[PDB]
């Protein structure tokens, strides 16, 4: 993969870090500080909105922060803009889930999360940038959101279930992460 160093699996970073362990700690810390500088913004949301979050999170490490996948992995690169546009257009047609009760918002957010996940716009950091977007999406809909509502094993299985078209595990994830109205 061209994003990585020659003869290695570590992606090239601005800090010239060459083992995967010390890059995760650098990525985890530097992106956490950046995550604390992301403000809620009102809709319409879009791929560019998602790209803006990714650039804010990882611009201290990767030059391609905010840029879209150039290699395949999922939706292939040449169709990602088309596919993301379909998803966000449908979300916009549903008023970005505003006006929906909790029960309805859970089913729509679960399905929208998997759809966007299939696009997978970035070489790395897709899940983190996507969840910050879905934080804004849920609180724009008017509800509290905390990813502490589920643990990692449940999250992995819900995403696997969603790969195979079964959304019920994704729905109970948001059933446990979406709370009272703001």
């Amino acid at each position: 993969d061209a994003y990585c160093y020659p003869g290695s699996t570590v992606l090239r970073n601005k800090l010239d870090i060459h083992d995967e362990a010390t890059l995760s700690e650098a990525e985890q810390q530097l992106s956490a500080i950046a995550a604390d500088n992301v403000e809620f913004s009102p809709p319409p949301y879009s791929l560019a909105y998602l790209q803006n979050i990714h650039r804010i999170l990882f611009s201290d490490l990767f030059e391609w922060a905010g840029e879209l996948r150039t290699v395949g992995m999922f939706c292939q690169p040449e169709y990602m803009e088309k596919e993301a546009s379909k998803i966000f257009t449908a979300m916009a047609a549903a008023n970005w889930f505003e006006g929906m009760e909790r029960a309805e918002l859970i089913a729509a957010v679960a399905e929208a999360y998997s759809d966007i996940n299939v696009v997978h716009p970035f070489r790395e950091g897709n899940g983190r940038a996507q969840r910050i977007l879905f934080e804004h999406l849920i609180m724009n809909a008017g509800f509290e959101i905390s990813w502490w509502g589920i643990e990692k094993d449940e999250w992995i299985y819900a995403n696997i279930a969603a790969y195979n078209g079964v959304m019920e595990p994704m729905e109970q994830v948001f059933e446990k992460c979406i709370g009272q109205a703001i």
Partner: protein, 43 residues
């Protein structure tokens, strides 16, 4: 609602990102999301 939405996000984003790091496999707990964060001074 807009100013309250931004206020809610600013109150919860740091804890939510620590939780989001936990979903990705990072060894981060709830206390890590409550701790003071160091300034950007990458070594």
């Amino acid at each position: 609602s807009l100013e309250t939405k931004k206020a809610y996000a600013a109150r919860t984003r740091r804890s939510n990102y620590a939780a989001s790091l936990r979903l990705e496999g990072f060894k981060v707990t709830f206390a890590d999301g409550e701790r003071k964060m160091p300034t950007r001074e990458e070594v």
